[PDB]
Amino acid sequence: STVAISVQGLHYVGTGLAAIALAGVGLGIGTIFGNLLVACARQPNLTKMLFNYAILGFALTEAIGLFALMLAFLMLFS
Amino acid sequence: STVAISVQGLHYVGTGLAAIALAGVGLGIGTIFGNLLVACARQPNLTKMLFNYAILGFALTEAIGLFALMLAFLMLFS
Amino acid sequence: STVAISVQGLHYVGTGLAAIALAGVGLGIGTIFGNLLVACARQPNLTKMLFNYAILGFALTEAIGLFALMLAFLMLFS
Amino acid sequence: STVAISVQGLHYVGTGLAAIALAGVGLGIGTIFGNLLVACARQPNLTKMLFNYAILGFALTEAIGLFALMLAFLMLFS
Amino acid sequence: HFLLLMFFDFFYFIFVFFFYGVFCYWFILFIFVFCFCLLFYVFLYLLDLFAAILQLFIFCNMILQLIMDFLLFLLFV
Amino acid sequence: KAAPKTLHQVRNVAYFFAAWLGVQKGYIEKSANDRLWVEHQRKVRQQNVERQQALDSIKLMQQGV
Amino acid sequence: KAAPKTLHQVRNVAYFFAAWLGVQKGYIEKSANDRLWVEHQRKVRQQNVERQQALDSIKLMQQGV
Amino acid sequence: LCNAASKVQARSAKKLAALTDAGIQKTISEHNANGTDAAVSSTKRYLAEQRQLFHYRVVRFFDECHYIISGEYFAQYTKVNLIWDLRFLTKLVVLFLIGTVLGRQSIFPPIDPDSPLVEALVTKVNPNY
Amino acid sequence: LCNAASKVQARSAKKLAALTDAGIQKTISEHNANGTDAAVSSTKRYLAEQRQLFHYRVVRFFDECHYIISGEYFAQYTKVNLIWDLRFLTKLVVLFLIGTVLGRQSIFPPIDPDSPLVEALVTKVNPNY
Amino acid sequence: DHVEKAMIMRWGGTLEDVRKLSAKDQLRVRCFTDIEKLYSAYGPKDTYLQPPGDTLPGKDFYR
Amino acid sequence: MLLGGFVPRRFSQFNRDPCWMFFIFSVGFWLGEYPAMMIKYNARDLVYDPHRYVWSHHDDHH
Amino acid sequence: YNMLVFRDPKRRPQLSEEERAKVVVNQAEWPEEFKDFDPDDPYKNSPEIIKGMSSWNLFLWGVECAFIYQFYELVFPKSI
Numbered sequence: 003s004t005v006a007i008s009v010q011g012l013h014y015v016g017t018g019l020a021a022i023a024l025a026g027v028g029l030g031i032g033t034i035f036g037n038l039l040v041a042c043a044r045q046p047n048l049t050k051m052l053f054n055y056a057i058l059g060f061a062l063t064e065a066i067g068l069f070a071l072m073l074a075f076l077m078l079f080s
Numbered sequence: 081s082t083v084a085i086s087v088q089g090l091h092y093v094g095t096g097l098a099a100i101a102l103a104g105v106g107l108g109i110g111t112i113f114g115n116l117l118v119a120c121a122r123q124p125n126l127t128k129m130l131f132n133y134a135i136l137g138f139a140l141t142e143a144i145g146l147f148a149l150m151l152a153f154l155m156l157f158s
Numbered sequence: 159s160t161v162a163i164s165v166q167g168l169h170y171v172g173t174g175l176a177a178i179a180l181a182g183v184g185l186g187i188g189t190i191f192g193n194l195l196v197a198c199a200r201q202p203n204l205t206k207m208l209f210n211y212a213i214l215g216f217a218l219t220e221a222i223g224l225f226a227l228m229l230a231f232l233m234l235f236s
Numbered sequence: 237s238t239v240a241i242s243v244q245g246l247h248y249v250g251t252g253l254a255a256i257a258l259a260g261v262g263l264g265i266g267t268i269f270g271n272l273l274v275a276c277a278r279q280p281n282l283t284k285m286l287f288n289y290a291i292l293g294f295a296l297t298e299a300i301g302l303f304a305l306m307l308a309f310l311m312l313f314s
Numbered sequence: 315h316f317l318l319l320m321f322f323d324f325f326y327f328i329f330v331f332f333f334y335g336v337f338c339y340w341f342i343l344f345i346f347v348f349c350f351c352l353l354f355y356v357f358l359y360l361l362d363l364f365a366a367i368l369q370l371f372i373f374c375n376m377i378l379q380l381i382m383d384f385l386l387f388l389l390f391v
Numbered sequence: 392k393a394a395p396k397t398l399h400q401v402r403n404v405a406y407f408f409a410a411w412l413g414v415q416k417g418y419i420e421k422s423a424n425d426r427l428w429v430e431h432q433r434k435v436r437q438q439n440v441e442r443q444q445a446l447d448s449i450k451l452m453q454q455g456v
Numbered sequence: 457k458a459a460p461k462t463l464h465q466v467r468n469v470a471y472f473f474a475a476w477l478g479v480q481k482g483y484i485e486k487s488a489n490d491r492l493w494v495e496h497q498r499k500v501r502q503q504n505v506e507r508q509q510a511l512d513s514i515k516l517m518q519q520g521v
Numbered sequence: 522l523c524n525a526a527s528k529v530q531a532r533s534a535k536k537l538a539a540l541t542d543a544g545i546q547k548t549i550s551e552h553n554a555n556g557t558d559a560a561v562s563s564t565k566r567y568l569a570e571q572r573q574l575f576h577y578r579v580v581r582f583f584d585e586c587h588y589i590i591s592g593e594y595f596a597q598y599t600k601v602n603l604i605w606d607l608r609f610l611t612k613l614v615v616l617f618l619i620g621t622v623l624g625r626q627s628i629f630p631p632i633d634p635d636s637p638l639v640e641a642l643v644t645k646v647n648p649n650y
Numbered sequence: 651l652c653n654a655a656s657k658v659q660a661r662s663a664k665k666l667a668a669l670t671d672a673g674i675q676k677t678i679s680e681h682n683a684n685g686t687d688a689a690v691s692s693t694k695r696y697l698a699e700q701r702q703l704f705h706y707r708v709v710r711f712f713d714e715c716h717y718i719i720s721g722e723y724f725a726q727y728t729k730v731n732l733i734w735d736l737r738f739l740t741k742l743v744v745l746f747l748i749g750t751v752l753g754r755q756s757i758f759p760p761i762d763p764d765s766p767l768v769e770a771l772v773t774k775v776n777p778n779y
Numbered sequence: 780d781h782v783e784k785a786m787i788m789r790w791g792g793t794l795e796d797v798r799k800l801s802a803k804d805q806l807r808v809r810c811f812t813d814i815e816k817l818y819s820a821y822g823p824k825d826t827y828l829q830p831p832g833d834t835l836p837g838k839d840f841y842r
Numbered sequence: 843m844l845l846g847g848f849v850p851r852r853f854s855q856f857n858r859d860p861c862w863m864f865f866i867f868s869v870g871f872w873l874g875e876y877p878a879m880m881i882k883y884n885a886r887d888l889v890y891d892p893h894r895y896v897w898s899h900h901d902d903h904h
Numbered sequence: 905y906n907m908l909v910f911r912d913p914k915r916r917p918q919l920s921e922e923e924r925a926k927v928v929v930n931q932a933e934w935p936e937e938f939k940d941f942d943p944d945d946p947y948k949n950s951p952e953i954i955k956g957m958s959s960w961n962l963f964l965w966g967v968e969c970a971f972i973y974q975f976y977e978l979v980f981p982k983s984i
């Protein structure tokens with residue numbers, strides 16, 4: 003027979019999962035600054051262009067992290 | 081017996097799981113740019129072709145993340 | 159007692175789990191291009207050839223994600 | 237039928253999951269402060285610039301860490 | 315094709331039922347969303363065009379690999 | 392290039408801006424009214440549900456199980 | 457005065473006439489609908505009057521003068 | 522049905538011949554010789570000019586804004602400018618009111634559910650309108 | 651807020667200088683020297699010409715009607731005329747539909763009182779609209 | 780086919796019942812079906828989920 | 843393979859080739875069908891079906 | 905230049921600078937369609953296929969066809 007159930011607390015669980023993705027982002031960041039330093043040591047003359055490309059790396063990875071965070075916040079308030 | 085149950089909040093759970101698919105996407109993008117810097121340090125004259133290939137890699141990885149995000153938003157609205 | 163229970167929302171959960179597969183696929187693709195850059199800065203005369211192989215690798219690696227994605231659709235539309 | 241439930245304890249579970257986001261974050265920092273050392277040995281003359289870039293990367297990762305921490309605390313005191 | 319269908323449905327929805335915001339004070343949000351949708355539209359079409367050809371290439375490559383695994387070549391003397 | 396003897400273009404832009412601001416005033420007013428009516432309909436449905444529940448309760452008492 | 461190479465003015469007049477005829481179609485439709493609704497409201501009022509008269513008659517019988 | 526048409530054509534022909542503008546008559550004669558339409562040609566020339574003058578309009582707008590902001594406009598202020606500004610203000614007010622009416626898509630403000638005038642809405646003769 | 655304005659003005663100035671139309675440049679130079687507006691002058695010239703060409707339009711309409719009625723138009727009928735007539739028919743249909751919608755002041759036909767859709771009218775969320 | 784199915788199921792369950800309506804009513808019904816199509820997964824869910832307390836007919840209306 | 847052919851420089855040149863004339867006509871149809879849907883499906887007098895809760899595809903496919 | 909993904913082909917030069925400098929240009933021999941020829945706009949003076957038929961007119965024709973397609977049933981509805 004039919005039983006429709008609306009469990010309110012579940013929206014917390016999913017929110018937490020949406021935050022786990024942030025790890026794959028944050029680690030992502032370090033990698034870019036893990037290698038940037040090495041590059042600056044290998045070719046110190048390009049300390050500027052490499053910095054800009056890493057910042058672009060941060061932007062693209064960071065953008066993926068806000069897309070996940072939007073799902074995290076939407077389910078926390080709904 | 082023939083019991084049947086429908087639960088409302090479960091779509092918050094699955095959605096969150098799909099968001100975790102952006103952890104390896106994030107990371108991956110990270111990795112590309114990391115290597116890019118080293119490459120630009122090893123062969124500084126190739127600052128544009130390597131940038132183009134990095135953009136291509138980001139585009140493909142973003143397509144995968146987007147494949148996942150479609151499910152994440154779709155279950156959240158089902 | 160003996161109850162034939164049919165829960166409806168579970169198909170979301172499984173679907174989300176399938177999306178986690180992409181976390182590898184995405185990452186894997188990045189790895190390829192990472193090495194590609196390190197390979198183009200180590201022997202640029204082969205760039206075009208290398209690019210081709212990378213694309214082949216991308217097409218093989220991506221294939222796997224699709225499998226997972228298919229399952230998601232099957233469970234999400236059933 | 238029409239049924240609705242409010243499981244309070246779930247607010248803990250989500251708070252735990254968000255904490256896992258720090259796992260990558262912390263790891264990311266390590267990667268930075270790993271390569272930094274390898275970068276300082278090769279070019280000890282550039283310790284200051286590399287140190288500044290490492291601090292920048294640490295702050296960027298800490299941003300994501302605070303995002304996850306904010307989610308966890310909100311789901312803890314709510 | 316599933317992804318294309320879903321994205322097209324979303325674009326139709328927002329385009330038809332939220333274009334009036336162009337005449338409203340939140341027009342900038344709609345313009346941002348619309349530009350993002352156009353970008354996503356072009357990106358998806360390019361990706362599908364490339365993927366179809368590449369998948370045919372691999373389909374034929376698998377068969378040729380089967381054939382090549384059992385071919386033996388003699389040397390002319 | 393002498394100073395402009397007329398300010399036609401500034402006046403045209405001002406006309407557009409005035410009409411646009413009026414449109415925004417009207418849109419805000421209409422949106423507020425729509426939200427009010429949505430809330431009113433929700434309250435009406437809730438009252439109808441409560442009335443039906445009360446009727447069912449009285450019928451249950453008449454049933455006397 | 458050579459023959460006209462274009463028929464712009466005739467086309468413009470035809471455009472106006474087409475729009476005007478469409479307007480007339482819509483106006484006729486709306487007027488018919490309004491007349492129908494006026495008759496419906498009149499019937500509703502008449503039914504209400506008859507119901508009130510019947511109620512008054514029953515109350516009169518209950519009065520029993 | 523034909524006499525009226527002939528009379529109208531004759532009247533318009535007389536009026537067309539009456540005007541003593543050299544340019545208008547020259548254009549009419551040229552288009553009659555070529556069999557083309559002068560009015561449509563005028564419209565196309567106008568739209569072409571306006572298409573080519575759009576950025577001129579933008580430059581003029583910025584020049585006028587600088588002229589007003591610099592205070593030079595108010596230095597030579599006269600009564601004629603006051604008349605023009607009053608006209609400008611009147612148009613602004615009327616445009617704001619029309620914009621409000623179009624924005625709410627109603628001449629009158631909408632009735633709130635808690636108002637006692639809701640009965641009026643319920644007792645509409647034609648609910649479609 | 652000021653840098654953007656300067657950039658827009660510079661871009662429009664470049665585009666204005668780019669055009670290689672002798673008449674447009676001459677008019678722009680003359681109006682800049684006199685301090686007047688070229689676009690507004692163009693609009694006034696256009697409206698004056700159209701005011702002076704109204705009876706020309708009437709005469710042309712009657713001439714075209716005679717040309718069509720006499721059968722001379724169909725004698726030289728070609729495919730291009732067919733294309734133009736198809737365009738004309740399409741515009742006529744669209745104008746008729748728009749006219750109907752405006753005449754009844756509703757996109758959809760109004761609901762009759764005896765229709766079962768009257769409930770929909772009664773259950774409107776916002777009776778004002 | 781989908782449009783006709785919706786019309787038949789929502790207005791009697793038989794073709795004759797639908798034909799008992801006028802062309803204008805059928806137009807309204809078909810355009811509502813189009814609305815549902817355009818919403819799909821993003822429109823409001825009250826187009827097919829009856830809120831509690833709603834006075835409109837339910838699923839057992841014709842049964 | 844996208845090798846060559848007539849390519850209009852701007853909108854005004856689409857009328858210099860019959861194929862691009864058909865293309866711009868089709869583009870007009872494509873882009874103009876959206877405003878029509880905005881007007882038609884956001885109309886004031888558009889009313890939801892009273893019997894929309896009698897049946898839905900959701901119950902059918904379930 | 906480009907129109908979406910359609911790129912205008914460009915002829916490769918075949919003459920060297922020395923030989924090219926000795927070439928005398930005489931536009932009087934050129935066709936009227938190509939005078940003041942510009943690689944960035946080679947079809948500016950190209951004739952219209954139909955005289956008086958603008959690109960905007962065709963675009964508007966398509967828009968009107970779409971409006972008819974969507975609005976005809978609103979004025980002439982038909983029964984199932």
Ligand SMILES: CCCCCCCCCCCCCCCCCC(=O)OC[C@H](COP(=O)([O-])OCC(O)COP(=O)([O-])OC[C@@H](COC(=O)CCCCCCCCCCCCCCCCC)OC(=O)CCCCCCCCCCCCCCCCC)OC(=O)CCCCCCCCCCCCCCCCC
Nearest residue numbers: 468469471472475476479560561564744748751967968971
């Ligand atoms: C609720 C929301 C609903 C929304 C619905 C959707 C809304 C629309 C969305 C978009 C839809 C798709 C696009 C469709 C576009 C269609 C329009 C279009 O393209 O137009 C261009 C088109 C010309 O294009 P073209 O052929 O390429 O032109 C080539 C050259 O450029 C030619 O250049 P030119 O130099 O010729 O330029 C001037 C030209 C161009 O001018 C324009 O462009 C005009 C404006 C264009 C837009 C018009 C839209 C019309 C829509 C319906 C009405 C809405 C209000 C419009 C207000 C207009 C104000 C000016 O002027 C005209 O077109 C003149 C037209 C009027 C002719 C007047 C002649 C009257 C003679 C009467 C004699 C009677 C004698 C009876 C004797 C009987 C004896 C027994 O012009 C028209 O179609 C004109 C239509 C005018 C209709 C007016 C109807 C008014 C209502 C009826 C009259 C009621 C009062 C009077 C009653 C009197 C008693 C009888």
Ligand SMILES: CCCCCCCCCCCCCCCCCC(=O)OC[C@H](COP(=O)([O-])OCC(O)COP(=O)([O-])OC[C@@H](COC(=O)CCCCCCCCCCCCCCCCC)OC(=O)CCCCCCCCCCCCCCCCC)OC(=O)CCCCCCCCCCCCCCCCC
Nearest residue numbers: 336337341403404406407410411414615619622689690693
């Ligand atoms: C329900 C029924 C309700 C019925 C209510 C009653 C209905 C009316 C009944 C009668 C009432 C009494 C009469 C009142 C008449 C008032 C109108 C009048 O006389 O006009 C002549 C008057 C010029 O007369 P004048 O000063 O003697 O001219 C001298 C020369 O003849 C000058 O000659 P010219 O050569 O200059 O000729 C061209 C001139 C003349 O053109 C015209 O005559 C135009 C048509 C005139 C009638 C307009 C009526 C407007 C009524 C409201 C809207 C209704 C729809 C109108 C559709 C018009 C389509 C073209 O063009 C203009 O006027 C251009 C105006 C537009 C300027 C565009 C500039 C935009 C810049 C934006 C920059 C933003 C940057 C932001 C950066 C921020 C950074 C943080 O022009 C106007 O007033 C223009 C008003 C335009 C209002 C448009 C509003 C549209 C809605 C808002 C925008 C929403 C979409 C866009 C949003 C974008 C996001 C921001």
Ligand SMILES: CCCCCCCCCCCCCCCCCC(=O)OC[C@H](COP(=O)([O-])OCC(O)COP(=O)([O-])OC[C@@H](COC(=O)CCCCCCCCCCCCCCCCC)OC(=O)CCCCCCCCCCCCCCCCC)OC(=O)CCCCCCCCCCCCCCCCC
Nearest residue numbers: 565568852853854869873874877958959960961963964967
């Ligand atoms: C480069 C890329 C190209 C495309 C690539 C492939 C596709 C890629 C996808 C995207 C494509 C975008 C769309 C194509 C571009 C269209 C615009 C254009 O360039 O036109 C040039 C065109 C001039 O080119 P032309 O070939 O030299 O034309 C010569 C003359 O036009 C003279 O022409 P004629 O000799 O044939 O004259 C015929 C006749 C015919 O004239 C007319 O009929 C005038 C039109 C009247 C309005 C009718 C409908 C208008 C359409 C609106 C809906 C459009 C929906 C689709 C738009 C999508 C945009 C993305 O004219 C007249 O008689 C004079 C008109 C006088 C009447 C004025 C008053 C009108 C009142 C209207 C009343 C109705 C209003 C509604 C309320 C009514 C309530 C009762 O400029 C205009 O005419 C523009 C006026 C309208 C502007 C707004 C139009 C909609 C929005 C367009 C946005 C486009 C964005 C592009 C971004 C690019 C960034 C890099």
Ligand SMILES: CCCCCCCCCCCCCCCCCC(=O)OC[C@H](COP(=O)([O-])OCC[N+](C)(C)C)OC(=O)CCCCCCCCCCCCCCCCC
Nearest residue numbers: 736739740743860863864867962969970972973974976977
């Ligand atoms: C004695 C003799 C008497 C003769 C009297 C003659 C009276 C004539 C009266 C007017 C007739 C008009 C007929 C045409 C209009 C028909 C409208 C109609 O049925 O619409 C319904 C149909 C739609 O039917 P529908 O209503 O089933 O579709 C609705 C579909 N849904 C519900 C999904 C939205 O409309 C159309 O299909 C319109 C298509 C466009 C029509 C115009 C075509 C013009 C040509 C364009 C192509 C060529 C372009 C070339 C460009 C490039 C050139 C190089």
Ligand SMILES: CCCCCCCC/C=C\CCCCCCCC(=O)O[C@H](COC(=O)CCCCCCC/C=C/CCCCCCCC)COP(=O)(O)OCCN
Nearest residue numbers: 334336337338414418623624779877880881884885886888
């Ligand atoms: C006879 C027509 C006269 C035209 C005058 C128009 C004046 C309008 C000025 C204000 C417009 C903005 C209003 C903001 C609120 C609109 C809300 C809305 O959608 O309401 C619709 C009115 O909206 C419409 O019908 C039209 C929607 C949008 C139409 C778009 C017109 C054509 C646009 C062409 C776009 C092509 C590309 C141009 C690009 C330019 C910008 C980049 C009516 O329904 P409601 O009573 O609110 O309730 C309905 C629910 N049952």
